[PDB]
Design a protein around this nucleic acid. Sequence first.
RNA 1: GUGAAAUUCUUGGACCGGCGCAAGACGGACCAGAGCGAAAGCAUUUGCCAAGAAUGUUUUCAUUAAUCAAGAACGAAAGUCGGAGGUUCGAAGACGAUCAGAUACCGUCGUAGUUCCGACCAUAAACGAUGCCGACCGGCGAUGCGGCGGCGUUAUUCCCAUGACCCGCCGGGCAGCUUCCGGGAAACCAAAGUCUUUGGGUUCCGGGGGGAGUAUGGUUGCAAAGCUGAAACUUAAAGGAAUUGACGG
Lengths: 83, 91, 150, 24, 98, 70, 160, 102
Amino acid sequence: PLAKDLLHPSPEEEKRKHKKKRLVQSPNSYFMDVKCPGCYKITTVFSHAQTVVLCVGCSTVLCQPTGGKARLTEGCSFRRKQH
Amino acid sequence: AKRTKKVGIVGKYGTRYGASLRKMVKKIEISQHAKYTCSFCGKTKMKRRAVGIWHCGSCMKTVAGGAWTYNTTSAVTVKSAIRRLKELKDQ
Amino acid sequence: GRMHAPGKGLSQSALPYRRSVPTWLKLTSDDVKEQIYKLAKKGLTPSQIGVILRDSHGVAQVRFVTGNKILRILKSKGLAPDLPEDLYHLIKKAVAVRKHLERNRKDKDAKFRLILIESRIHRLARYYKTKRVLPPNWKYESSTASALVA
Amino acid sequence: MRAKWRKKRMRRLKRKRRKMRQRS
Amino acid sequence: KSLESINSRLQLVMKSGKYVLGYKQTLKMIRQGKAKLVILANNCPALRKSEIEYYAMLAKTGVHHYSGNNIELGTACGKYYRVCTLAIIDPGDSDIIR
Amino acid sequence: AQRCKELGITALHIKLRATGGNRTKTPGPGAQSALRALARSGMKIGRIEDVTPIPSDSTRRKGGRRGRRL
Amino acid sequence: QNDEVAFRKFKLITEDVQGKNCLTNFHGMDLTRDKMCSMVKKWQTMIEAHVDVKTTDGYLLRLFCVGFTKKRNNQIRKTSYAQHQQVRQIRKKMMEIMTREVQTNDLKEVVNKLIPDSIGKDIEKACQSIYPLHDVFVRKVKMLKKPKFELGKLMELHGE
Amino acid sequence: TKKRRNNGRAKKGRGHVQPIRCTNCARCVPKDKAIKKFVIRNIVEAAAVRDISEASVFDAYVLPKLYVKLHYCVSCAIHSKVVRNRSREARKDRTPPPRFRP
RNA sequence: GUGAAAUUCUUGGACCGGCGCAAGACGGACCAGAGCGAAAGCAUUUGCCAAGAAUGUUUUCAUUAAUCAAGAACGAAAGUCGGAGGUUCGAAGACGAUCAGAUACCGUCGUAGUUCCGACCAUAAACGAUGCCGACCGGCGAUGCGGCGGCGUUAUUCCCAUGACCCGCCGGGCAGCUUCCGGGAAACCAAAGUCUUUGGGUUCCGGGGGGAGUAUGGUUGCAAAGCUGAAACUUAAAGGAAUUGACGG
Ligand SMILES: [Mg+2]
Ligand SMILES: [Mg+2]
Ligand SMILES: [Mg+2]
Ligand SMILES: [Mg+2]
Ligand SMILES: [Mg+2]
Ligand SMILES: [Mg+2]
Ligand SMILES: [Mg+2]
Ligand SMILES: [Mg+2]
Ligand SMILES: [Zn+2]
Ligand SMILES: [Zn+2]
């Protein structure tokens, strides 16, 4: 394809492309509100967190660090931050 | 300045006894007259008294060791083997 | 490519185009500064401080939210480490490799890695002496470096 | 000749030459 | 992990907490009752180790047997001399839990 | 087979063996004929198994690194 | 055995003879050459474990177990290779579930349960959560030491 | 001229491959270079299968197989005609010869 | 044992079969145009010790970088020195064959060596006969690692996780197939392309064939030898890739 529109790529290929190789760099990570059952406060957690995030009001772990993304403990709820 | 190119400690033997024999006795004499770190007091004051006898100046500890070195590799492997056989013998 | 490896990896961090602080961040500049102060007193290096702050407290960039970098804040308060973090870790690695090597004399691979690490140490020390972070007479000695780390 | 055997012949000749010169 | 963790915690006790290095000062601090942790190199003489353990039992303070020797404990303290016995007046870094 | 029959043995298990070791593993030309002759001589046949010595690893095989030049 | 497999062989050394009857006891077992060679195949990983374990009555046995990774029915990839950590976990699992089937029981009920190779079957069942295996057997067992040869034990092994 | 792109062996990202001995002449050949044949032959001849079946003490006795992996240097492979020289274009294919099932 | 033999071992029980013992090597099959390592190289289990690429990162420092005379580390095999060990194989050597001869190819035996520890040597067709860093320039299917997303099958369990498959995407690798991208003397090469439309940075290095990697000097080494390295003289070709023919035990 000699006439690919490099200026305006559609979001499908914009997302399939590597983070650095996009037209403008965009991180693949995000921030999430996390709810621990039996607790009221809301924890802001990085999606690719490298540390065990703990609640200050309960001796419970929220996420476990993995290779790519922090695995949330079962029973915990989560939502995105502003897409 | 550097006083000898290669003979080092066996410069006291002059031109005698043959180059290969002087080279052979050089490392043995260096290890013989070296001061080793005492494993009891931690000081570098463990030196040979007689053949096989190594005395520390500070803690006055006398150890049975090798002829020219504080311990021989044979004896080290022996000690490790005896420890392994003891821990295998008991449970 | 890597300085001392034949690797050409691309794993990096893609900082977003939006430099603005997110609206859901309730931490103020002084609050983040106090958190950095507490973590530095606990003994964390600036990389670990940033990691903890991003993972737990939801702050994306300390520079974006406060206007200053973590090392700048620590140096302004007066509790920045005497050695730079990366130089300290390089010296720590060199000490560990030397400690392994003095027992494993046949580990020629370890000797090669030690040469690579010490070359990196000397290049980084040259850079820091050029930038006057380090004293002009600062020198890495293999014998006396063990007392500087851990 | 094979190049390896020419190399061997030359090495033999060089040892002989060194011996002759050392004798002087 | 334990050895590197205790080395790092000792490093942070230095430069941030009050300590004292050596046998005589360690005994003096213990009998003043303000030594909260006593670290002994495994190189320590057996009689000295036993006596310091008895003093610590009397003073109700903790004793940690460092997995090094006096040279390595000096290096862990950051000094260029051998230390065989040391005491911590106050950590300042959660080496000693409140 | 006739010796076995006159000594009163009727059936045979079979253990085929090659040279084994670091040397060849294929049985020689005589195995097939020997076993067929045993079968056709009236001897009964039971289990059959190869017992060639297979090294988990052996000493160096003879012949040099250039082999048997022929 | 009346209807068991044929690729399993037993050693059955003779300890005592009385009258015109030699009397045997277990000495070891081995798989056959053809069965073993047919099991070994390409584009798959085999895990081998060995363990020295003492029975309750003083018989010391060296057990050798083998297993082979199994490809799925819908698998398109040619090879079915287990990673090194998976192989190590499988080996550790199949060593620790050969120990406990020998340590807590006598040689008689060790032999009668390795007759159908139930040890290999439970090894294969246990290892499915790491990597599937199909040809799992106790490949070999050899007697290392024997306890003093009590004739009463021999006679109760033979008769009642 | 370079006859083969792979230099007549499978070594691609390796420095050294351990040698093996040719089954015919005991020559040291790199393992990735030697010609390998995995022969799976009936332990008895197809002429003698009937005699062994008749002389068997069993009824449904499956005759054992014989599993041998043979390694050849290319000299013995060519002399024994397991491999043959091919044209310049025909050297490039790697498909094994058909089994000829029917 | 061989093409055939013979040297050799054998009624003293050789070979063969069985049960044991001892020693030192070697880690088959799994094992792949698969992995790792700067190369050399690396394959039985388990533990310990440090190390590492790739990946993930909205972490940190902020140009700290690339290539590099001199210098330094490692560097297959053979070889050298000292100590252990020496099963097999096996330079030298001995013998039997073969032959016109046969100091060989084949066979029997067998020293050094091959093994381990420590110290040298620094050479290989040490090869991809192909410097490193960076950018761009086709398609396709695979494979290894890591990550991400999805119908489903499977393992237990009560569901998700987590493994084993299936379908894709991304990044870094070993490669492969294909192509009038282009290049090249061509073989061929997605690099050996982006070169008369000649300039991204930088290191080493060649100047017809021999003499010759020789002489001499210097330097390194216990030695063997390694590094540096001419000239006289001689020669009209020597070479590379392809084509046709001829020939092939
Ligand atoms: Mg021929
Ligand atoms: Mg040719
Ligand atoms: Mg090579
Ligand atoms: Mg070598
Ligand atoms: Mg020697
Ligand atoms: Mg021989
Ligand atoms: Mg350049
Ligand atoms: Mg010229
Ligand atoms: Zn002392
Ligand atoms: Zn061959």
